[PDB]
Amino acid sequence: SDRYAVIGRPINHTKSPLIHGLFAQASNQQLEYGAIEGSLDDFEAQVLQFRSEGGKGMNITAPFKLRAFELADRRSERAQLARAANALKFEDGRIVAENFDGIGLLRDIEENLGEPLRNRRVLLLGAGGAVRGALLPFLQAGPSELVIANRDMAKALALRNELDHSRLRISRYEALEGQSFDIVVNATSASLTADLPPLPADVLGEAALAYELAYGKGLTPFLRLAREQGQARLADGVGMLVEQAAEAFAWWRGVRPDTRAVINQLTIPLE
Structure with a gap:
């Protein structure tokens, strides 16, 4: 009807x-x-x-x-x-x-x-539309830190300034060296072309969850990297x-x- x-x-x-x-x-x-x-x-x-x-x-x-x-x-x-x-x-x-x-x-x-975000370390890969749409709800959930990693740091910086939220941080990929996270979300399109975002693989070492935004595309290079680096549960x-x-x-x-x-x-x- x-x-x-x-x-x-x-x-x-x-x-x-x-x-x-x-x-x-x-x-x-x-x-x-x-x-x-x-x-x-x-x-x-x-x-x-x-x-x-x-x-x-x-x-x-x-x-x-x-x-x-x-x-x-x-x-x-x-x-x-x-x-x-x-x-x-x-x-x-x-x-x-x-x-x-x-x-x-x-x-x-x-x-x-x-996996509630509250009080946990959350890394989001990308700064595209999907990330922009996720920022408000993710921040409302009170993670201990929410970090956006992106190639385009002008884009990421624009976003950080718009929100001015105490829990939001931005990073270059290379700078993630030596950092650990509880939940990592790949919101890049890398997985659609069976590629891999520029992560220091150790970044997934402590993760409880690696989440691929792409749907039904097999073990993406990102989720494969997560299985190699630690014991994160994997989801698409x-x-x-x-x-x-x-x-x-x-x-x-x-x-x-x-x-x-x-x-x-x-x-x-x-x-």
Whole structure:
């Protein structure tokens, strides 16, 4: 009945309709969740068309999250910091933008994987949109330190100044020499091209958790490095993907769907 959709380019292999369909059947919600191949030229017009046809909300994927952010009338705090929106809701009577990637990631780590950040040392690799979206929720969780390691230190410095939070620190990769962390999150795209971020491998020695944002891509070079260097539990981005979807589902429907079964079925065993 009520219609939702994901929009991005390419969209052929999106898991979003699958995920929200599973949510809908488990939670007894009558809705249809479709997929739209977004045009580089008229993305915005496509979003407006869907709304015009009675659509209730959308998820936004690459490469349109920034453009979704700009098109929106009202934007949540995480969306403003990321300058990127991965969910829209059409309510009396405009277009509201949210970004749930960071909340999904945090919930997967703290609840699903049993590693609350509170009072622990957390290293995030990268300073891209995913990292920007994760910063507020991660800091809200009170880690003893949150360290962003990145190649582009101007970008990382800009972020640190914007937040001015007592627990946030930035680092060059080389500078990580001799440092230890409890939770390490690889939010670079290295794993998508089966590559490895420039870590002194010893950085993973004390880790309880190495988390790869990439989904279903085998033992990435990062997770392999983690297994070599210590006894961290290894995870990829399947839980993040499902938890962020769930946040949007609750926003639209007022139901928090069970994510356990869904995460299980989409999980592609690393080992």
